[PDB]
Design a protein around this nucleic acid. Structure first.
Ligand SMILES: [Mg+2]
Ligand SMILES: [Mg+2]
Lengths: 335, 336
DNA sequence: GGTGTACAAGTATGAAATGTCGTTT
DNA sequence: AAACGACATTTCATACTTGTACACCTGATAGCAGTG
DNA sequence: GGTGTACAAGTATGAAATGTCGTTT
DNA sequence: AAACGACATTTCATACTTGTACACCTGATAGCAGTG
DNA sequence: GGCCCACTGC
DNA sequence: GGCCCACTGC
C-alpha cells in the first residue's frame, strides 16, 4: 500500500538503465513492484533516450504558460515617469488588475518607501538665492576656515508632554496600544539658545505670553555678550526672522561688532541649530513629561553637559559639506 | 555520468523491497548500477525494517537540535504585559539577542501595528459623564427613533493646500519622492456647516479674521432657520460644547427658535456625526487639493455635497446608536 | 466614515509529458 | 519482441482573474512682529 | 547622525543516520 | 550467506550568535471666546 | 500723533 | 463701566 510519484518512478528508470536493462524489461519490473498504476512502455522508451544523452534531470522541462500582457520594462517606464503612483493607477494604464501589478512589483525588486518631508515649496528665485549664499560661503571657507569663530542660535518650542504613537506586536486582526493625542495648546516654553563649536554659550526659557520683540532680542544679545566675554573675532549666524531683521537689532550687531553671516530664507537645513542641535533634542524629547519650567531647565542643563564637545564641533563643521550639496542641487533641498 | 542522492537511493530500496528482494541482494545491484559510492549493506537492512512497518517516508526523521532558551509563551507573557515594546527590550528580558526575537515573533504569528490616535486623555469622571449621555440617548431611541428629526453641525478648517506624503515604489536604497511640508499659517477658511439626514441644509465660509462669537453664531442660526423653513415641516439640535455654543446668548436663541438641544458630553468628536462621518469623508477628497480663491473652495464644496447620495448623509446620522452602545460598553472610554 | 496592498482560490494558456496503435527493426 | 512515428489526450507551472482580509486613513483644539 | 528590524554567514547542538565487525539464524 | 547487536563515527536542520544593510526619525512656521 | 493694510520669514 | 484673572472646550 505504497504508490510512487513521478520523480520516484523516473529514478527507478535511471536505476534500470544503469543495470543495463532494456526498456520493456524495466516496464515489466515496475508492474511486478507497484502494480498496474505505472506508466506505459512508451514513456520508459522515451526516458531511455534522455539517459542516452546523459540527461538525468528528473523534473519536467518547464511547460507551456500564458504569455505576458505587458513586460517588466513597460511597467518600469511608468515608474520613471512617476515614482509615487497607486497600484490601481498603474494597473489601469497597463490594462491589467491591481493584484496583477502587486505581484510584478515583487517579481521585480521594488518596495514601498515614504515621502521624506522638506521645509518649503521653493521658487525658481529662492533656489538661486540659496545657491549663491552657499557658493559664496564655500569660496570664503576655502581661503580660510572661519568656523572656529562661528556663534549661532535659534528659537524653538518645547512642549511639557511629547506623545508619540506606540507600535504593538500583536496577532493580525488585534488592535494596537492607542495613545492620547497632544494638546496643540498645552503647556510649552520657547527656548532661545546660542552656541559655539565649543559648547552652549547662553540660553533663556520664555514662558508663553512673553513674545519675541526686537526689544527682547537685543536684551538677549547683551546677556549673550555678557556670557560670551566671561566664558571666552565673532561671526554670527541666525535665521531671517523679523526680530532678527529688525534695524534696531542690526545696530546692536554693529555695536557689539559681530559680523552677521548671509543666510537665505527657508533654510533650516543650513542652520546648525536646526538640523543638528535641535534634531538631537527631538529624540531625547520623545515620551517626556515635565512638571514645571525648572523641570525643563534642569533637564536641559544635565543634557547639554552630558554631550561631548566633539558633538557641538561636529555639527558646526558639517556646514561646508552641506553648502556643496546645496550648490550641486542648484539651490534645491538636497537630502 | 551520474551519482544519486540520499532520496533517490532510498526510493530504489523501496523498489527492490516491492520486487521481493533480499537486503544484501539489493545492495549488490546498487553497486552494479552506481559503483562503490553507495551505502553499506547495514543501512539497506535498516530501511527494510522501516518498510516492513509500512513507513515509506524517504526524508530523515528530524535530527537533534539545540534546546530553546525560552519558550513561545514566555515571550507571549511579555507582550500581554506590554504590547508595544522594542525587540532589544524584549531580548534583554529573555537574555537572548535582538535578532533572536525578530525570528521568534515571525515563528509565532505576530506583526507590528501602529498605535491609533484618540482625541483626548479622559478623566474617570469625563468617561462616566460620556457613558451616561450615551445610556440616556439609547433609552430614548428605543422608545422612538428621533434621528429623522436631527439637525447637527460643527465648524472645521480647510487649508488652500493639503499636502500629503508620497509613497514611491523603487529599488531598495533609492530615495522616494520627497514632498513639501504644509505651512500651518497658510491660507485657510473656517467652514461652518449644518445638515439633516436629508442632505446639507446651510453653510457659511469665514475668511480668517472673522472669529466665531456668540453674536456671529446666532446670525448663522437665523440664516440656518431661514434656510430650514424653506425645506421642511419638530427639530432636534446637536452641536459640540464650544463656548459660542454654550453662550447664554445662544441658549436663548435656541428656545426662541424652539429647537431642542441634545445633550452632548465634552470631548466626543467620535459621537459627533459632523466630525466622524461628514468631515472624515471630506478629509480624503481634500488630499492633494489646491485652491486659488475662496470661491474655488465654495465651488468645490457645492459640487461635492450634491455629488453624494442621500443615502450617504442618512447613513452617518443613523450610525449614532451603534456608537452609543459601544460608548456604554467601554464604560465611557474611547471605543476605537 | 475610504483607500491601498496582499493573500486566497479559480481559470485560461500551451508546450512538455503521456497514451494509443499501426508500422518498422 | 522491442522499438518506433504519427496522432490524440492529459498534465501543471504560470500569469492572469475576482473575492476578500485587513492595515491604516479620516474626522476630531484660531500667529506673530517687523517694514513701507 | 540615531534607532529599530531583518537579512546575512558562522557555530554549537544532539538525535537520527551511518559505518564497522564479531555473532546469531 | 544473510541478518543481527553493540559499538564508534558522521550527517544536518535547528536555534541561536555577531556583522551589517537600510527604512524611517529628527530639526525646521506663536489660540480663542465665553463664564464666574 | 493714531491706525490700517499687504507684504516678509520664523 | 473698564480690565485682569483662572477656569473651560472647541
Ligand atoms: Mg527660529
Ligand atoms: Mg467644532
Amino acid at each position: 500500500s505504497f504508490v510512487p510519484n513521478k520523480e520516484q518512478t523516473r529514478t527507478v528508470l535511471i536505476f534500470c538503465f544503469h543495470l543495463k536493462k532494456t526498456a520493456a524489461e524495466s516496464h515489466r519490473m515496475l508492474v511486478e513492484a507497484f502494480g498496474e498504476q505505472v506508466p506505459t512502455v512508451k514513456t520508459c522508451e522515451r526516458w531511455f533516450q534522455r539517459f542516452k544523452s546523459g540527461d538525468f534531470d528528473v523534473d519536467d522541462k518547464e511547460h507551456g504558460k500564458p504569455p505576458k500582457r505587458y513586460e517588466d520594462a513597460e511597467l518600469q517606464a511608468l515608474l520613471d515617469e512617476d515614482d509615487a503612483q497607486t497600484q490601481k493607477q498603474l494597473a489601469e494604464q497597463l490594462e491589467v488588475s491591481q493584484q496583477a501589478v502587486s505581484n510584478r512589483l515583487r517579481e521585480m525588486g521594488k518596495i514601498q518607501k515614504v515621502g521624506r518631508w522638506v521645509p518649503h515649496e521653493l521658487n525658481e528665485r529662492q533656489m538661486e538665492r540659496r545657491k549663491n549664499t552657499c557658493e559664496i560661503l564655500l569660496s570664503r571657507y576655502k581661503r580660510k576656515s572661519f568656523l572656529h569663530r562661528i556663534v549661532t542660535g535659534d528659537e524653538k518650542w518645547i512642549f511639557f508632554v511629547n506623545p508619540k504613537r506606540k507600535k504593538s506586536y500583536v496577532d493580525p486582526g488585534q488592535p494596537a496600544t492607542s495613545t492620547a493625542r497632544p494638546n496643540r495648546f498645552g503647556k510649552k516654553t520657547m527656548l532661545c539658545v546660542w552656541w559655539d563649536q565649543s559648547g552652549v554659550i547662553y540660553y533663556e526659557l520664555l514662558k508663553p505670553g512673553e513674545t519675541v520683540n526686537a526689544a527682547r532680542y537685543q536684551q538677549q544679545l547683551i546677556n549673550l555678550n555678557r556670557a560670551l566675554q566671561r566664558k571666552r573675532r565673532v561671526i554670527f549666524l541666525h535665521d531671517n526672522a523679523p526680530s532678527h531683521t529688525a534695524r534696531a537689532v542690526r545696530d546692536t550687531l554693529e555695536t557689539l561688532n559681530w559680523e552677521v553671516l548671509p543666510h537665505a530664507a527657508y533654510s533650516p537645513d543650513l542652520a546648525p541649530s536646526d538640523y543638528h542641535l535641535f534634531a538631537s533634542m527631538g529624540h531625547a524629547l520623545a515620551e517626556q513629561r515635565f512638571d514645571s519650567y525648572e523641570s525643563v531647565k534642569k533637564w536641559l542643563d544635565e543634557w547639554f553637559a552630558a554631550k561631548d564637545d566633539e558633538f557641538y564641533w561636529r555639527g558646526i563643521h558639517k556646514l561646508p559639506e552641506r553648502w556643496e550639496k546645496c550648490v550641486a542641487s542648484d539651490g534645491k533641498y538636497f537630502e
